[PDB]
Amino acid sequence: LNKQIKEEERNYILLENAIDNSNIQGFQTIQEIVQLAMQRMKMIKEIIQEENYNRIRVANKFITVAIPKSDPEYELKNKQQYAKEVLSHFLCKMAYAFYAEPETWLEFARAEAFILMDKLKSGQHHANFFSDENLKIKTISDELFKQAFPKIEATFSSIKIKKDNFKMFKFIDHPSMLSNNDVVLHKGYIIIYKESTSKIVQNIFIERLLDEMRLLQLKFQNNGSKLDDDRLSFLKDLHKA
Amino acid sequence: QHQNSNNMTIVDLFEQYDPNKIPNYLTNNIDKIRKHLEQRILTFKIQNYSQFIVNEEVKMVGRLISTENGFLNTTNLRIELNRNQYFDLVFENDFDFGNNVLFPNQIVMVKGILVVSELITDHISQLIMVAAGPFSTVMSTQYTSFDNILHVAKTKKVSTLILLGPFLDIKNEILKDGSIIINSKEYTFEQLQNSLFEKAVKELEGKTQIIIVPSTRDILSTDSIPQMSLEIKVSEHKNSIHSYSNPAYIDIDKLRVYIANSDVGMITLQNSLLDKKIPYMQQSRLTFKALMNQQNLYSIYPMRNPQDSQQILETVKLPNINDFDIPFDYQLEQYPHIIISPSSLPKFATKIYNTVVINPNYVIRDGSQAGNFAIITLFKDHERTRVDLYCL
Amino acid sequence: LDYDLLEEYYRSYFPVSQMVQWLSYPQDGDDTYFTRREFSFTLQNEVYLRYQMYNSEREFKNALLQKVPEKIDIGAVYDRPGKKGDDIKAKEKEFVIDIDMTDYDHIRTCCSKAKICEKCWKFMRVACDLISKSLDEDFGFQHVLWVYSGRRGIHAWVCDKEIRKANDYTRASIIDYLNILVDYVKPSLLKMEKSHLIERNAMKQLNQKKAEKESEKVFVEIVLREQNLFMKKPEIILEFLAKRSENLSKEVEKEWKTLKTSEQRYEALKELVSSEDKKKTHYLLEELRIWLLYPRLDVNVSKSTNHLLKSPFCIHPKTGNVCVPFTTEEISTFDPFSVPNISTLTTEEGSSKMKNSLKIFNKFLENLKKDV
Amino acid sequence: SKRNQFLTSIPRVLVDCKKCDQTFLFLGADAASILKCKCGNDIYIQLKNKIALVVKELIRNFEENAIQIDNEEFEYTHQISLVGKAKQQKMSSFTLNQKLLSIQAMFDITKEEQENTQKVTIEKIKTIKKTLDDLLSKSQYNNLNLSNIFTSFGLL
C-alpha cells in the first residue's frame, strides 16, 4: 500500500512512465483528451514566452489538490490529479518528437525543466535527486580553499565564508559549466556557490530528456506514419497552437 | 397441468454479453475480419476436412466468395485460401454436379488436377405453443389477432407459449407516426408495449410461461441481428415472462430448442445455387443440410436481397456472430432438439440428422387474415415428438 | 629532388622505436596500441596514401624506406584495424593546439609575409609561455610536447591519462576556454565585471594594488612592438580606439601630429586615456594590449576528435627544415636558425645538432615513461 | 459560441403538429426554456417518437458496412475479400459519432437557464437526453483506450 504510493509519487515528480486511463472515471472520451492536451501546451508556450512559475500553475489549476481523508470518494481526487499530470506530459512530448527538428526541441526541454524545479522547491522531499546529487558534489578541501583564495574572492563580490562556498566538482563530469562566468577554475577543478545546485539539476535532466526524443523519433522514422486516424490528425495541431 | 407449469424452470445456455462492454458496438475494422477468417479457415482445415484425405493432384480448403458484385453464376464461383493462394474453379467441363449446396461465405474442400466435400457429420407428455408475428393488421393498430391467439391458447390450456417476431415494426407504425385512441389519449412506443404485455399477462393470468424473441424489424431494438434482451416492463410482478437474444438456444426440462428468428431459410435458398429439377421440399431440405454442417445458420455475410444488389435485408456484425456457433457431433449428443426457422417457405415439419425443424409462417401473412401457427407434443419415458400445424 | 631523400631516409627519422614507445603507453597495460593507430602518407606528385596501418614496426620501416614519403602524418586509434569497411569508430586521440604566423601578418611590417624575420619570432616566444601558463595554471595537464614545423609556427601535442578518451563535446569546451581573441575585441563576458581572472594573468599583470611596476609590465610589449613596427601604422589602433567616443579619437589624432615619435606617442596615449573617466573608459589599455599581442588559436585542425597532423622529424625540400622536438623548458633557449637541414653533409656541427635534438626528445620520452 | 459548429451538421428532424409542420433546429436567440410549437400542444410525444425512429434509422444505415471499389471507383460492395488491398468505408465511424454528438448537444441546457423554470420541463429534458446519453456511453469509438497507442513505443 505505502510502497505503491511511493512509486506513484516517484513517477509523478520524475514523470518518466505512463499509466492507463480506460478505467479512470473522467478522462475516457476523445473530447476530454483534446482540452487536456491543449491546456499543458498553452501553459508551456506562455512560460517560454515570459522570462512567477508558481503563480503560473495556480492559473491552470495544475496544483496537487489538498483534501482531507474524511472526504467521501477520496480515491477519485488523487486518481484524477495523478491522471492529469502523467497523461499531459507524454502527449505533449509525442508531438515534438515526431514533427519538430532537433534544433527545436530545446524549447520544450527548458519549459519542462523549469516546472520541475518549482515542483522540487515546493515539494516536501527532494530525496529522488538528493541521493544522486551526493554522487556529483564533492566537498572542497581546506587545502584547496586557501590555495585559490585570491581567485575565489575575485569573482565573488556581492552577498545576497568557508561554508558559503559549496562542494566542488570534477572537470570531466560537467564540461558544460566552465563557460559560465560565475565559476572559478584551478588546475582542472571547479568551485561553485550552493545556489547553483539547482542549475546542475536542469543540466542532467535536459540532456536525458532531449536524448529520448531522438530515440523516440528514431523508433518512428523507420515507419511511415501513425496508423490510427483519430490521433494522427490530432497530434499535428499540437505544434503551432 | 398446473403443477406442470409450476415445475417449468426455464433456462438458457448462451453466455450473454454484459450490456456495458459490447466488444464492437460501433467501431468496425477490415483487418480484424481478415485475421478472424484466416484463423477460422485453419480451424476447419485442422478439425474437420483432415479426416477424409491423406496427403498429379492438389487438395485444399477455402472460402467461397463471388468474383463479381452481381449475383453468382456457375462460371464465376471462386475459391480462396489465404493471403497468397488465390485461384479459380473450372469443374464445369463435364457438367457433373453432386448433391451439395454452394453459397457465398461457405468453406468447402475441393481437390482436383474435381471432387467436393461439404464437411459431413457422421450419420446417427407435454404440449408447447408457438406463435409468429406480426400481431397487427397492415395499416391498422388494433392488434385484434393477439386477442384470438390468446383465446385459442387459453382454450387449449397449453403449458407454455412462445411469442416471436416483430411487435412494433417499421412497416406499420411509420404510416401512423403517432398513437391516438378512442378515449382521447396519446400513447408512445413503450406505453403501447406495456399495454400489450399487460393484456397478455392478464389474459393468461400467469398460469403459463411465455417466451419472447425480438427481431430486427422491431422499432424499439436498434441493435443488429445478434441483438439481445429486448427489455420488458410489466405491471404484473410474477416471473412468467422472459426475454432472450436473437439466435436463442433454450433449455426446457429436458428439451433444447434453437431459434433462428429471422428469414434465414428463404435467403439461404434463393441466394445460393443448386441443381434444377429438384422439388421445393427437397430444395429446403438440402439448404438446411448445408447450413447445419457449418455449425451456424447465419453463414452468409452479404445476404443481399434477391434481384436487388443495393438493398440488404438484414445487417450482420461479422466479428461478433461466430460466438453463437454450436457444433454438431452426434457421437456424443444430439444438441439441437428442435429448430424454429420462421420464414416465407411453405409450411413443413420434418426430421434431419435425428432432429426436427418446423416453419410456422407469419400470422396475418401479406396482409391477409389467413394466419397460421403450429403446436408440438412430445412424450418422455427416447425422443418421440408429435407435430401438427394449424391454419386460421 | 627525391634521390637525396631516398638515400637519406636511413638517417632522417631515427626515433622509430622512440615513436613506437611514445604511442605504446605501456602503463595502461593494453596491447596493440600501435596496431590501431591511424597513419597517412604523401607520395611524389599528389599521390596520397591513407590508412597505411602497420601492425609490425619492421614492415613499417621497410615501407617507409622503400617509398618516398615526403610527408608523414599521425592519426587516431580506432576500434579495430582495417580500412574503408565496417565503418570503424575511433576510441582515442591526443589533444592538439596549432599556432601560425598568418594571424600576425596584419600587425608586422618588416617582413615580406613569405619568409620570417628575427624581429617576428618574439611573438611566438611570448605565445608559447602564455599558452603553457594557461594550461598549467587552469588545468592539470602534467605533460606537454611542442613541435616546430617547416617555415612557420609550431603545434602543441599533449599526452595525458584522461583527455585521450575525452569526447568531442569536452574538446570543444576546453578549446572554448583558451580562446579569448574573439572575432573584433575581447568578448563582453569578461568586460562586464571587474576583478576578473583569466586575461589579467594573460597580460602578465599579477595581483597588484607604481612607475617600476608599470615599466616592468610594459617593457615586454615595448620590446616586441616599438622595434618591429613602432606605431608606423596609426590607423590600425585608431580603428580600435574609434570603438570609444569620437572625442577621444579626435583628441589623440590631434595630439599625435606633433610628437612624431613612437614611444612618446604611446606614453601620450596612456596619459590621455589614464584619467578621462571612471566608467566610460575601462581596461582600455588591457584590451588594446591583448588584441595587439595575444595569438589567435586555430580551431580548424584541432576541432574534430579525429584528424591528421604533420609528424615530428618530417622533411620537405622546399624550405629545408627539420621539425625538431621541443619542451616547455626549451622556450627560453630555442632558436629557429640552428635547426639541422638536408644541406649539411659530413659535417660535425649538424651531427651535434641532431644529437641534441634526439637528447631533448628523449628527455621528455623517459620523463613520460617514468611519470606515466 | 459552441452551438454553431453543432448546428452545421444536425440531421433532419421534422415534427408533424396540428395544422403545421416545422423543422426542429432546437438550441440550448432561441428560447430554450420552452420547447412547444406555436400551438398550445407541447409536441413532446411526437418529438420523442421521431428521435427514436431517426436514431434507429441512423444505426441501421451504419451497420450495413460497404467498402469502396479499388481502381479509384466510387462504386461500393458489401462483399469483402481476403486479398483486398483497398480499405475505405462508405460511412466511417467518425461521421456517425459526430452526428450522434450533434443530436445530443442540440438538446442540452446550461445550469443557469434551468433554475428559472419549472421542474417538469427540465426533468422531461433530461428524460429525453438520457436516451441518447446512454447510447453514447456504450460506443467503442467515443470511449478511447489509449494504452496500445503508445505502449508499442516502449512506455508502461
Ligand SMILES: [Zn+2]
Ligand atoms: Zn403547431
